[PDB]
Paper text:
To study the architecture of UPF3B’s middle-domain we crystallized a construct comprising UPF3B residues 41–189, comprising the RRM-L and the N-terminal part of the middle-domain (NOPS-L), in complex with UPF2-MIF4GIII and solved the structure to 2.6 Å resolution. The area of the structure spanning the RRM-L domain and its interactions with UPF2 align very well with the previously reported UPF3B RRM-L–UPF2-MIF4GIII structure displaying an RMSD of 0.44 Å. The following NOPS-L linker region is composed of conserved residues D148, G152, T153, I154 and D157 which form multiple polar and salt-bridge interactions with R796, K797, L798, and Q794 of helices α1 and α2 of UPF2-MIF4GIII. The subsequent α-helix in the NOPS-L further contributes to UPF2 interaction, primarily through hydrophobic contacts with P770, L771 and Y774 in helices α1 and α2, involving UPF3B residues I154, Y160 and F163. Y167 additionally forms polar contacts with R768 of UPF2-MIF4GIII at the end of the resolvable portion of the helix. Conserved acidic residues D148, D157 and E159 of UPF3B are all interacting with or in close proximity of a basic patch of UPF2-MIF4GIII comprising residues R793, R796, K797 and Q794. Using SPR, we determined a KD between UPF3B-41–189 and UPF2-MIF4GIII of 3.6 nM, which is 200-fold stronger than the KD for the RRM-L alone (720 nM).
UPF3 is a key nonsense-mediated mRNA decay (NMD) factor required for mRNA surveillance and eukaryotic gene expression regulation. UPF3 exists as two paralogs (A and B) which are differentially expressed depending on cell type and developmental stage and believed to regulate NMD activity based on cellular requirements. Here, we show that UPF3A and UPF3B share structural and functional homology to paraspeckle proteins comprising an RNA-recognition motif-like domain (RRM-L), a NONA/paraspeckle-like domain (NOPS-L), and extended α-helical domain. Here, we report two crystal structures of the RRM-L and N-terminal region of the middle-domain of UPF3B and UPF3A bound to the MIF4GIII domain of UPF2.
Residue numbers in the entry:
A (entry chain D): 768 to 1017
B (entry chain C): 49 to 140, 147 to 169
C (entry chain B): 767 to 1016
D (entry chain A): 49 to 170
């Protein structure tokens, strides 16, 4: 590969781990951003964040947060490209892409941590995890087969990356509403007939859910049943109904 | 408000001039450009485009014409296209632009690269 | 073979109400021993069994009760509670031999709104239950809603025939507008079932019943010509509900 | 705010007393009525009761404790009860006014007396 193109793979996939982030930024303000081909090459490099090791993905979002003060469109295209890759990941849904898809979701969370996207982008992605290709009755579907529990890992990855900031204001209620729908989705999967005493629900998924929910809400009632999960959704949607004035007034 | 629209799952070899060849007459828009081969999930390669409409009514008729619109690639395979509101609604000077050509640390890098 | 006071109450409601003025009937109804709980319960039960009244005189019963509540205020609340209970039980039983009785009670409930015994909340609460109780959010047939069972369409149209003309101004105008969106999807759910073929076509009298009722209430309404068109209407409307609730933005 | 609660699909032979016996401890309320055998869909008979709560944090406990509670009839049949908000939220409000001066006067009414003879020659 050309010299300049592997110069970036050093800057983004190697150096960012053990170097000042503020030094590599001016070294990429260096690049010929007028040239559309090399500007395209590194938008592609940040979209392929699966190359970066997990605990430095936030450093890539830290770098990109600084550049958009000089080439703002590069952040627009990376954000649009990551959101497209998350959607395509659910459409492909091959287990060989798990590490890449987890990194992409983690990246989107860090991009919110550095104010590249607002909470609406995160919550759109979160709801798409629990509903895109999902049957509205919880029945297994084409894109969400019974043993496929990857949506839960995708939800937990984003909530563990950026969910702690949804502690106040509107984002606190937006998270509270989504957690009601997330608990019903979790219990839709737990109630499928595939899970028996011989084929039990994976205990490590149970811990991952409780960690993510105990980290965000120390005083949350984990529904220990599907009917407990369903009634809370009914209660929440009843308040949605009242404020919408669909049977009542005002 | 909601004004940015994406047309995705297009054939990976389709170009922008060919795409608007199917889209004409295009409604009133501010932004419209086209990306391809930028995914992390090779070899599942598609193309897409984003449009920002100037009027709320132009969109309800745009998706009615092109959500499901089947495109064709080089060897006959079909590509039904999807029209939704884009997930990121935000749409798209410096003096140090293009100065790593003739830049010291770049020059040190390239001799580390020859071996 | 019936107690004479019981036959007299049936005479006033099931015979005299169509032939004589309702105020003359109200004069006699006030003289009953309303302080006796058995007699008060028999009059209430007589009015819940509205199916004994000719269809064209059901509105005279609501007009009678609306004057009766000036002297026996609680009687109108018990009659409404019983009619709404019977409508819910009718969908749980759903035996075709009770078709005329379930149509009567739906017509009665609409007339009870026309004489201001209930407000629009009760009507729309009942209208939405016709399209949701025992109905899969999938749209697939249910045990309470089997494919050839089109009684929900006739229950909805019966109420819209009776009281829908008044939902043309103010907040009740938007409540009907939203409901007709959900009603057109429910209609196209039934039309989309595999059971309907050229050998077993969708009943054309149901089609005319739908458009007759919808053209009586909204002259410029758009009748959906496909299931995809009806789904798009619901999605666009629910996108508005999402914008107003701030579950993703705000 | 919604305060009227209905408990339905109770056994058709149950009484108001047997129901409150199963309901204690009952929270505070304005309204507690009991109906049965008044349906038009014979022989599908059931009993029901309405309760209007003073504070609305009790309904969620009442629903969580009795929605599904199995009652028994006269012949040992099971009757899992349903607890929901009443579709008509209006409830009776005390004895507002005095009695109508005409109630209980049908026993000496002339129009009702002529009917009694026609009911002797049915």
């Amino acid at each position: 590969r050309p010299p300049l193109q592997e110069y970036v793979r050093k800057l983004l996939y190697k150096d960012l781990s053990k170097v000042t982030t503020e030094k590599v930024l001016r070294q990429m303000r260096k690049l010929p951003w007028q040239d559309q081909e090399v500007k395209d090459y590194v938008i592609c490099c940040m979209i392929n964040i699966w190359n970066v090791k997990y605990n430095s993905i936030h450093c890539v979002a830290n770098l990109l947060a600084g550049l958009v003060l000089y080439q703002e469109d590069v952040g627009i295209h990376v954000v649009d490209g990551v959101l497209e890759d998350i959607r395509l990941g659910m459409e492909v849904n091959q287990p060989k892409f798990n590490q890449r898809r987890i990194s992409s979701a983690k990246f989107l969370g860090e991009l919110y941590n550095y104010r590249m996207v607002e909470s609406a982008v995160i919550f759109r992605t979160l709801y798409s995890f629990t509903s895109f290709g999902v049957n509205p009755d919880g029945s297994p579907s084409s894109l969400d087969p019974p043993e496929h529990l990857f949506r839960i890992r995708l939800v937990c990855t984003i909530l563990d990356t950026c969910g702690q900031y949804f502690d106040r204001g509107s984002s606190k209620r937006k998270l509270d509403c989504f957690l009601v729908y997330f608990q019903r989705y979790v219990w839709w999967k737990k109630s499928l007939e595939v899970w028996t005493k011989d084929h039990p629900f994976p205990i490590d998924i149970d811990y991952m859910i409780s960690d993510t929910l105990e980290l965000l809400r120390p005083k949350i009632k984990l529904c220990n049943s599907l009917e407990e999960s369903i009634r809370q959704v009914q209660d929440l949607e009843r308040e949605f109904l009242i404020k919408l004035g669909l049977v009542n007034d005002k | 408000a909601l004004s940015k629209v994406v047309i995705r799952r297009l054939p990976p070899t389709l170009t922008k001039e060919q795409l608007q060849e199917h889209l004409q007459p295009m409604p009133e828009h501010d932004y419209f450009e086209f990306f391809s081969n930028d995914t992390s999930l090779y070899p599942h390669m598609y193309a897409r485009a984003y449009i920002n409409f100037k009027n709320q009514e132009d969109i309800i008729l745009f998706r009615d014409r092109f959500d499901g619109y089947v495109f064709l690639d080089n060897k006959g395979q079909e590509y039904p296209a999807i029209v939704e509101f884009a997930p990121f609604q935000k749409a798209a000077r410096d003096t140090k632009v293009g100065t790593i050509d003739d830049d010291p640390e770049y020059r040190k890098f390239l001799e580390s690269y020859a071996t």
